Amino acid sequence: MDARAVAKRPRDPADEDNELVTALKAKREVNTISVRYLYHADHQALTARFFVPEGLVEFEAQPGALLIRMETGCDSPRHLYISLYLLGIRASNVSASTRCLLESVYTASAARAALQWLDLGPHLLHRRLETLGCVKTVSLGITSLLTCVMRGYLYNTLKTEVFALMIPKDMYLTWEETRGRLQYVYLIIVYDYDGPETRPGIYVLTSSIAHWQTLVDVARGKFARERCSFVNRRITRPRQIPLCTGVIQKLGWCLADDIHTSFLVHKELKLSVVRLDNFSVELGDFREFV
Amino acid sequence: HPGFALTAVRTDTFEVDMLLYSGKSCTSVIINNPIVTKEERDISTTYHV
Amino acid sequence: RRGYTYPFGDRGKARDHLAVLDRTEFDTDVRHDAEIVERALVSAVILAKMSVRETLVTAIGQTEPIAFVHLKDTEVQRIEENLEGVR
Amino acid sequence: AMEANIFCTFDHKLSIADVGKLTKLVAAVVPIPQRLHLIKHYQLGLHQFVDHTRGYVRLRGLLRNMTLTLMRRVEGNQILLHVPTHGLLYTVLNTGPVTWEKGDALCVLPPLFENLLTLGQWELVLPWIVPMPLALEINQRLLIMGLFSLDRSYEEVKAAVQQLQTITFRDATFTIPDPVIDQHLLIDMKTACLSMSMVANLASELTMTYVRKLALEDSSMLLVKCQELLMRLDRERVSPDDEIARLSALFVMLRQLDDLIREQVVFTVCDVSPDNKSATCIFKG
Amino acid sequence: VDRWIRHAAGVERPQLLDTETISMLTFGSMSERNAAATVHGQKAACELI
Amino acid sequence: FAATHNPWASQAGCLSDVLYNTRHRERLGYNSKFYSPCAQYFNTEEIIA
Amino acid sequence: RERSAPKPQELLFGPRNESGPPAEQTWYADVVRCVRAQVDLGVEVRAAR
């Protein structure tokens, strides 16, 4: 509460000594540790560490994969973490070629077991899947560590490089001709109520439409067959109670110039991806539409 | 006695104190100054060396 | 079907009695139907008793007798008179 | 460098044991009814909102109105509270009965259950921190057992209500309080249930008339089969001003019901301690 | 026959949340319960061929 | 230098081979968490590797 | 076709499970048109359910 005090500019780390420097200089003591610059001490991204068994780590050594947590009716391993790719083998959209490719890759007890736990339960996918951020690390082993972020950019420890977000092509979805200066990236899951096994379709969307209402109207216009089949199964196969023709989840904002088409290599297998070279994460939970 | 015998197999785990020999300058170890990275969490802040 | 829809006290007991009731169908032999009809009825009466919280005998070696539940006495009296006539 | 905290003052003198007890919850979510720099301890918690005529539904509406604020530090004569800005990660305490897993989307629920800081006239009632799937489950179960109030006399209704009352969620089993007391239903619950009943009932009547006209236009071919469906359920068994009033009333009842229909995600978890009582999480909407 | 053999061998019926628990078990789990007291140490599990 | 001293254990598909090879055990439903002393001698795929 | 639903370990381990028929059937047909007496007999045609 003074003229000189209030006029003060804020205090910033590059000029104010770091706390360990303060302590050591005030005691006039030295450590063998080099501690002047603290790594990760200027990151805006909020990160977390996850442990996964080796079988699920396929295609995950490449930073930029999207990670999902799924529920299991058991007790002790009850939550596993799976990637969007492994979610693609079950996706009744993706073409036979890519499906057989990532079925040839994902060959272990862990991933296949994730698949039975997905196909077993009577719940719909969106009532079984909770979404995590995008991953950037790999620490191998029989059980491996992954570092994942859900708020912000996706970059190396020194910020020397930015890791893209990688989408498998058969999931990549577009609805507009002239690309906006800013576009959001959404995840869409839709259900085919034809046949005994209701076939789930998986999409990663990109659009400039920020508003929920116009986005959902456009989506419902483009997904007419699934809504028709929803009403059809309501009519023809009653006292089974469907809900949702699809759900939409929002995570991201990228500038159209950043997005590019690319290839992905693993064990000399050749998978095709759509890449968002600079990309930021902002996760919101699902919203449902019919 | 039934008509078939059987051979059993067993494993016992012993506890042992080892001794190791090495020759002078058998390896050379390369190291730098230890490095600290910061993980910021509200109630407790952690630093990894 | 009614038992599977009904809100019982614990799923295990009613589920087991309803399951032994469920797979009780006949077998194209005359003699065996006499056993299996009784074997189905005893479990059905167990289930009905559990449904309305009247007791069931848990003594080893004793089976809950085959009978109605909560009918008015005139109905069951006419049932028994008809059963005598069938005799 | 520094942050804008909220200061709270306790008027009743505090024994050293009680101010110690304050520390044991120095990271829990304490709701506040308003944004102001110095507030009196009566404002903390939900005790002022506890009217024994009004139950869970009104309290969740108010909690949607409330401002959530982490207790931050404890000193004599005054307590520091911190209002969490959006996006930043924070440490919270698990006050509810259930444990947590990484990635859980959390909500707030009114107290459904040793009472903390039983001052002579006041009691500290914290909200329940719960994952959203259990939030949906418990809201629906409480709502349905609200419906059965009018016929609790018959035995099977009692057994069904008991089945709805017991809830299990990742190895935790607990019994929620019955929203029916002394055969009388709390007014907030009664109004919510009546509103839902009326919404369904009025939709039944209005939808046939307003679909049969629209079916002429629909090139998306779903409204014709919609009419087919409403005729199918029809088979199972007027003034214009009154009609527009009926539509207005339909949307009035729909609006009154919105608290039961949608709830916000407030926290989502990043990591959990072996000390499971506490976990770090980022703050949502 | 199954009940007779299980009572002769002395082992209880497999009781579990059958499907998901059995998939978890095939993935691997610690089912065998501990003994109440073990003056001698870890069980020398013998296998018969 | 006999062909085999235990025909029921050395043959490529006999009792002990299907009972103790991890691969044949995977074709059945074992529980992976239990150690088996025979698995060391019988997992012939790993032995060939 | 006469295969019972797989036991869980069969689906967790080993070579894949498969589906019997292909999505596309192979058919032959005879087409008759009455307005101009004409019959099409040597037709190879594809069918899908």
From Swiss-Prot, chain A:
GO cellular component assignments: host cell nucleus; viral capsid
The protein's name: Triplex capsid protein 1
Entry's localization field: Virion; Host nucleus
Keywords attached to this entry: Capsid protein, Host nucleus, Virion
GO biological process, one term: viral capsid assembly
Species of provenance: Human cytomegalovirus (strain AD169)
Keyword Protease: no
Protein family: Belongs to the herpesviridae TRX1 protein family.
UniProt subunit comment: Interacts with TRX2, MCP and capsid vertex component 2/CVC2.
GO molecular function, one term: DNA binding
Keyword Zinc attributed: no
Biological function: Structural component of the T=16 icosahedral capsid. The capsid is composed of pentamers and hexamers of major capsid protein/MCP, which are linked together by heterotrimers called triplexes. These triplexes are formed by a single molecule of triplex protein 1/TRX1 and two copies of triplex protein 2/TRX2. Additionally, TRX1 is required for efficient transport of TRX2 to the nucleus, which is the site of capsid assembly.
From Swiss-Prot, chain B:
Domain of life of the source: Viruses
Annotated coiled-coil segments of the chain: none
Compartments in which it is found: Virion; Host nucleus
Record family assignment: Belongs to the herpesviridae major capsid protein family.
Assembly notes: Homomultimer. Makes the hexons and eleven out of twelve pentons. Interacts with triplex proteins 1/TRX1 and 2/TRX2; adjacent capsomers are linked together in groups of three by triplexes, heterotrimeric complexes composed of one molecule of TRX1 and two molecules of TRX2. Interacts with scaffold protein; this interaction allows efficient MCP transport to the host nucleus. Interacts with capsid vertex component 2/CVC2. Interacts with the small capsomere-interacting protein/SCP.
Protein's job: Self-assembles to form an icosahedral capsid with a T=16 symmetry, about 200 nm in diameter, and consisting of 150 hexons and 12 pentons (total of 162 capsomers). Hexons form the edges and faces of the capsid and are each composed of six MCP molecules. In contrast, one penton is found at each of the 12 vertices. Eleven of the pentons are MCP pentamers, while the last vertex is occupied by the portal complex.
Protein name: Major capsid protein
Gene transcribed to yield this protein: MCP
Portion of the full sequence shown: 1029 to 1077 of 1370
Swiss-Prot record, chain C:
Tree of life domain: Viruses
Location of this chain's protein in the cell: Virion tegument; Host cytoplasm; Host nucleus
Transmembrane feature ranges: none
Record note on modification: Phosphorylated by host CCNA2.
Family statement drawn from the similarity comment of this UniProt entry: Belongs to the herpesviridae large structural phosphoprotein family.
Oligomer and partners: Interacts with host BICD1 and RAB6A. Interacts with small capsid protein UL48A; this interaction links together the capsid and pp150. Interacts with host CCNA2.
Job of this protein: Participates in the last steps of viral maturation and release. Associates with nuclear capsids prior to DNA encapsidation and later preserves the integrity of nucleocapsids through secondary envelopment at the assembly compartment. Interacts with host CCNA2 and thereby blocks the onset of lytic gene expression to promote establishment of a quiescent state of infection in undifferentiated cells.
Name recorded for this polypeptide: Large structural phosphoprotein
Naturally occurring in which organism (per UniProt): Human cytomegalovirus (strain AD169)
Lineage summary: Viruses, Duplodnaviria, Heunggongvirae, Peploviricota, Herviviricetes
Residues of the full protein shown: 89 to 175 of 1048
Swiss-Prot record, chain E:
Compartment annotation: Virion; Host nucleus
Top-rank taxon, per record: Viruses
Function comment: Self-assembles to form an icosahedral capsid with a T=16 symmetry, about 200 nm in diameter, and consisting of 150 hexons and 12 pentons (total of 162 capsomers). Hexons form the edges and faces of the capsid and are each composed of six MCP molecules. In contrast, one penton is found at each of the 12 vertices. Eleven of the pentons are MCP pentamers, while the last vertex is occupied by the portal complex.
Subunit structure: Homomultimer. Makes the hexons and eleven out of twelve pentons. Interacts with triplex proteins 1/TRX1 and 2/TRX2; adjacent capsomers are linked together in groups of three by triplexes, heterotrimeric complexes composed of one molecule of TRX1 and two molecules of TRX2. Interacts with scaffold protein; this interaction allows efficient MCP transport to the host nucleus. Interacts with capsid vertex component 2/CVC2. Interacts with the small capsomere-interacting protein/SCP.
Entry similarity comment: Belongs to the herpesviridae major capsid protein family.
UniProt name for this protein: Major capsid protein
Naturally occurring in which organism (per UniProt): Human cytomegalovirus (strain AD169)
Residues of the full protein shown: 1127 to 1175 of 1370
